[PDB]
Design a protein around this ligand. Structure first.
Ligand SMILES: [Mg+2]
Ligand SMILES: [Mg+2]
Ligand SMILES: [Mg+2]
Ligand SMILES: [Mg+2]
Ligand SMILES: [Mg+2]
Ligand SMILES: [Mg+2]
Ligand SMILES: [Mg+2]
Ligand SMILES: [Mg+2]
Ligand SMILES: [Mg+2]
Ligand SMILES: [Mg+2]
Ligand SMILES: [Mg+2]
Ligand SMILES: [Mg+2]
Ligand SMILES: [Mg+2]
Ligand SMILES: [Mg+2]
Ligand SMILES: [Mg+2]
Lengths: 49, 106, 49
RNA sequence: GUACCCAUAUCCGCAGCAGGUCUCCAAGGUGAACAGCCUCUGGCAUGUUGGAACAAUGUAGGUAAGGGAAGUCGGCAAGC
RNA sequence: AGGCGGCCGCCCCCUCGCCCGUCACGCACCGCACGUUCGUGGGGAACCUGGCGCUAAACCAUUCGUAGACGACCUGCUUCUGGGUCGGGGUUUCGUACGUAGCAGAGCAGCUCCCUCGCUGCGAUCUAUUGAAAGUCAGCCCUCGACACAAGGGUUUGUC
């Protein structure tokens, strides 16, 4: 990760961003759920219990 | 110098991947020989007719995914090879595959 | 790996403004760097030595 | 005269050559069918080599969002 | 693109470390060149001697995939926080496995306690067990659960 050798504004650098949602769906395939607690609360009980 | 005997659950479905249909089942035999040579240590590997039937029971391309095997190491006599020990791989049938692991057999 | 970000855009004069934007965003794991060595350089008339 | 081949190896083609050469016998199922496919009697080791990986390019096979011949001399090929 | 020079405290000697003058000698090799030099000139293999020190690293093999036509490149290998193989889970792909039971089921056939859904047998499917069963890294993640494996070899490499 190399620092930029020139200084530019361009209305593209140095703007305060606001993050809202970062998805953590299943990337090994098609993702359906966000968190493990949400997945277990949606699917309910199975043969694992 | 031991004469030991151990059971195994080889996974041919994850030891063969990307092999064509007309050569999928013969690669399983070389993979079983390589697995026996790696685990037991001797180069001489002899597999049985029951294991031959268990591998080739479903053709050339529908290779069974997991096979329960038993490996016995014995010595050779009567003008033996330079490799005195040899692994005699035999087949044992089992209905299920879950919660099965390597078992030393007396 | 790569994930999404739902991001608020504070860039005036656009259709993008005041709306959520989903972007393709990578993740780079960076462990801290343990300092080991110091190297000095001399300006030569062929470069740096 | 009476052996044997009668053939993708006993014939011809310079050869154990995807070439050519005249005939009889013909099962079960699906099926209109001696069509195509899978089995039985009967033969065979894949056709003058094997092992390892699956790069470019090629030879044969299959697909591909939207447009449907706008490419090309021509719907050539492929597909409905 | 550096290794010789300058200063101070001492060191064993030298007041001929140089020019002017006197004296006697050293090969005077008897006419002959390539002579005197920065030379204790540069490099290689060894020989006998003193002191001070050093105790490795590549390549193959095997494994690996972030890499590959073959070479080549990035990697692992300790007997304890090492790796490998099974198994366990996490993820996912497909869509509800065999067996069991049904007062579900187009109906059909058989029997008589002539039975007020009487009973049995065949019967595409359906229902509960069933978000079930099956595969899941060979190029997915974690495992201190179980097994053995581990310094085990072949080739090569030194600077007055
Ligand atoms: Mg005859
Ligand atoms: Mg011919
Ligand atoms: Mg012919
Ligand atoms: Mg017929
Ligand atoms: Mg008919
Ligand atoms: Mg006929
Ligand atoms: Mg031939
Ligand atoms: Mg198309
Ligand atoms: Mg389409
Ligand atoms: Mg059209
Ligand atoms: Mg038109
Ligand atoms: Mg034209
Ligand atoms: Mg045509
Ligand atoms: Mg079509
Ligand atoms: Mg089934």
């Amino acid at each position: 990760l190399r620092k930029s050798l020139l200084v530019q504004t361009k209305r593209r650098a140095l703007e305060k961003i606001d993050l809202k949602f970062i998805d953590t769906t299943s990337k090994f395939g098609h993702g359906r759920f966000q968190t493990m607690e949400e997945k277990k609360a949606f699917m309910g009980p199975l043969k694992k219990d | 110098n031991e004469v030991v005997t151990r059971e195994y659950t080889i996974n041919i479905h994850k030891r063969i991947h990307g092999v064509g249909f007309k050569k999928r089942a013969p690669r399983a035999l070389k993979e079983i020989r390589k697995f026996a040579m790696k685990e037991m240590g001797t180069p001489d590997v002899r597999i049985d007719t029951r294991l031959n039937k268990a591998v080739w029971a479903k053709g050339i391309r529908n290779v069974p995914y997991r096979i329960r095997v038993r490996l016995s190491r014995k010595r050779n006599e009567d003008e033996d090879s330079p490799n005195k020990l040899y692994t005699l791989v035999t087949y044992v049938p089992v209905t299920t595959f879950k919660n099965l692991q390597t078992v030393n057999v007396d | 790996g790569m994930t999404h970000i739902v991001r608020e855009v504070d860039r005036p004069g656009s259709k993008v403004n005041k709306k959520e934007v989903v972007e393709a965003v990578t993740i780079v794991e960076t462990p801290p760097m343990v300092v080991v060595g110091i190297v000095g350089y001399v300006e030569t008339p062929r470069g740096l030595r």
